[PDB]
């Protein structure tokens, strides 16, 4: 009875939230470039998808138009930038959160508050400072300077304050007697972190990976500012080429927007194996 009503109410909710996304899909399969029309286009075209997948399109008068942009290379660049930077964010956030949750040092509560507060500052003029930084950085360390993936990745690593609090909070739910048992077993704070705490906090690590991956896949301003070569573009940056002062290439933009959802979907699915209940079960009596 509860199962029947849940399935039905979920399906209707799914139907309602999926509708705007099916219109995106529709824009990508519609001939020419039109932001509005029927859910199933009256005139269907595979051309926008052909161009994004590297195929050449045969137009009305016999001319074969080659793909203007390497859309798949942009997607690969997005996956590398988003993947490496999500790893880095999980690495920096967990180590940070471990000290904040388990170790004592002067001004612990102040820095935690400060981290959260300083990340809340409006990034209205952030690009000017960032460009100056990376222009300066590039003359000394080339692989993280302007026009590099390293530089873009390096710049995303500062957004950890919220992830620190998130992981800290999860760490504090795990019964303290396990790390006590580890310390008596002879573990260092590092070994107890790596071999006891991290395997049991795996669901929140997945969350932090997922959220950082998404933020990086969709990020426009910083990546556009740093990257110059077309072949080095991420998809979010590349798809900006479809946007002009008076018109958008809606079809190509929509096709790109659907494509950028694919690595997100795949990462969300792979993360499910870490998003499990019952990890701490059987450990502590109480």
């Amino acid at each position: 009875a509860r199962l029947f009503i849940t399935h039905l109410l979920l399906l209707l909710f799914i139907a309602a939230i999926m509708f705007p996304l099916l219109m995106v899909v529709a824009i990508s399969l519609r001939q020419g470039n039109f932001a509005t029309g029927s859910l199933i286009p009256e005139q269907i075209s595979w051309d926008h998808w052909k161009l994004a997948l590297g195929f050449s399109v045969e137009q009305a008068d016999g001319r074969i138009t080659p793909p203007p942009f390497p859309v798949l290379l942009w997607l690969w660049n997005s996956v590398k930038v988003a993947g490496i930077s999500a790893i880095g964010i999980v690495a920096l956030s967990t180590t940070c959160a471990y000290a904040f949750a388990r170790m004592r040092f002067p001004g612990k509560a102040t820095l935690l508050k400060g981290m959260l507060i300083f990340q809340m500052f409006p990034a209205v003029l952030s690009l000017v400072a960032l460009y100056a930084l990376f222009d300066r950085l590039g003359e000394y360390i080339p692989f993280i300077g302007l026009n590099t993936h390293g530089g873009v990745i390096f710049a995303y690593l500062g957004g950890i304050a919220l992830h620190v609090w998130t992981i800290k909070g999860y760490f504090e739910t795990i019964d303290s007697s396990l790390e006590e048992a580890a310390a008596l077993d002879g573990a260092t704070p590092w070994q107890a972190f790596r071999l006891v705490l991290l395997p049991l906090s795996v669901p929140i690590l997945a969350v932090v990976f997922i959220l950082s991956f998404i933020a990086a896949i969709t990020e426009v301003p910083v990546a556009s500012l740093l990257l110059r070569d077309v072949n080095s573009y991420t998809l979010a940056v590349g798809m900006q080429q479809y946007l002009n002062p008076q018109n958008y290439l809606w079809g190509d933009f929509a096709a790109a927007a659907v494509m950028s959802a694919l690595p997100i979907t795949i990462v969300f699915l792979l993360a499910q194996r870490w998003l499990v209940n019952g990890l701490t079960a059987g450990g502590v009596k109480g």
Partner: peptide, 16 residues
């Protein structure tokens, strides 16, 4: 760790 002490915990504290 440096005390030369091992304990059988009352609540077991097994690594789950």
């Amino acid at each position: 760790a440096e005390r030369g002490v091992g304990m059988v915990f009352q609540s077991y504290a097994l690594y789950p």
